[PDB]
Amino acid sequence: YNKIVSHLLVAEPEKIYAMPDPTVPDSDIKALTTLCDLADRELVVIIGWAKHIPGFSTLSLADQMSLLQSAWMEILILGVVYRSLSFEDELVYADDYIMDEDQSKLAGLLDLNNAILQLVKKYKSMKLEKEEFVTLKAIALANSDSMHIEDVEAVQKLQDVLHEALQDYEAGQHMEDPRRAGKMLMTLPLLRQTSTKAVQHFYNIKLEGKVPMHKLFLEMLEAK
């Protein structure tokens, strides 16, 4: 099938471990600290991953950063969603960090994680494939609606290249549903909704000052 899809598949990063501190008592602070630490290390990996997206590294450094600062939470959430597809009512942040309903309540994350589980439920019904996941991550990056883009036409071209890849993949692989590409695009509003609420929630956690956060995570959070 589509070469851009095959290229994004081979550019997919390796799995990352959460490594919750086994000496620390379980608490809401421990869970939130573990999650923000894992997100910080995933952000490093996402920045390296984006350089494999056709045309991304030819953008100005400012435009690369603007796209990443607008899309980072959507990309992180799509990752947890994909890792969770073979599970029931659980979110697989990492192989060693899987959150059920009880742990979400203890962490103060029940409402947020239930929205993420709504995304999981929709993608399970659609039988989301890895090929479609990696293409949607790239589309979410290009379509992230930053207010600070210098070269709008170049960013629109990036959107178009990745949208064409999705369209071509679905036309060849899913002839039984001539509307599958559009159905995939119609899942992006819920992804944006859930990311918007997550950034809000964790900005409030940043303000309360009880959860330590690393430099890169704080930079992405303080942009938004």
Ligand X SMILES: Oc1ccc(C(c2ccc(O)cc2)C(Cl)(Cl)Cl)cc1
Question: Interface with a copy of itself by CB under 8 A: which residues?
Answer: 114, 118, 139, 143, 145, 147, 159-160, 163-164, 166-167, 179, 181-183, 185-186, 188-193, 196-197
Q: What is the rounded CA–CA span in Å between residue 121 and residue 110?
A: 16
Q: By rule CB under 6 A, what string of x and - marks binding of each residue 11-30 to ligand X?
A: --------------------
Question: Which of a copy of itself, ligand X, none is residue 76 near (CB under 5 to 8 Å by kind)?
Answer: ligand X
Provide long-range contacts, Cβ within 8 A and 24+ apart, for 46-51: 46/13, 46/72, 46/75, 46/76, 48/13, 49/11, 49/12, 49/13, 50/141
Q: What is the rounded CA–CA span in Å between residue 82 and residue 133?
A: 7
For the chain, where are the E strands, in sequence order?
A: 91-94, 97-99
What's the min distance (Å) between Cβ of 204 and ligand X?
11
Q: How many residues bind ligand X (CB under 6 A)?
A: 16
What's the min distance (Å) between Cβ of 79 and ligand X?
5
What's the min distance (Å) between Cβ of 36 and ligand X?
5
Enumerate helices (H) and strands (E) in the chain, giving the number of each: 10, 2
- Whether the CA torsion 106, 108, 110, 112 is positive or negative: it is negative
Could you give the angle at the alpha carbon of 96 between the alpha carbons of 94 and 99, nearest 5°? 70
Nearer Cβ to ligand X, position 4 or 46? 46
Nearer Cβ to a copy of itself, position 13 or 178? 178
Cβ count near 177 (within 10 Å): 11
Q: What is the rounded CA–CA span in Å between residue 64 and residue 168?
A: 26
142 binding ligand X? (CB under 6 A): no
Binding residues for ligand X restricted to 43-82, rule: CB under 6 A:
73, 76-77, 79-80
213 binding ligand X? (CB under 6 A): no
198 binding ligand X? (CB under 6 A): yes
Show Cβ contacts of residue 42 under 8 Å, excluding neighbours closer than 6 positions: 16, 76, 79
Using CB under 6 A, which of 70, 113, 144, 187 touches ligand X?
113
Given a contact cutoff of 8 angstroms between Cβ atoms, the answer to whether 96 and 20 are in contact is yes
What's the min distance (Å) between Cβ of 175 and ligand X?
34
Report the length, in residues, of the chain: 224
Mark the segment that binds ligand X (CB under 6 A) among 1-9, 54-62, 106-114, 132-140. 106-114
Binding site for ligand X (CB under 6 A): 35-36, 38-39, 42, 73, 76-77, 79-80, 93, 109, 112-113, 198, 202
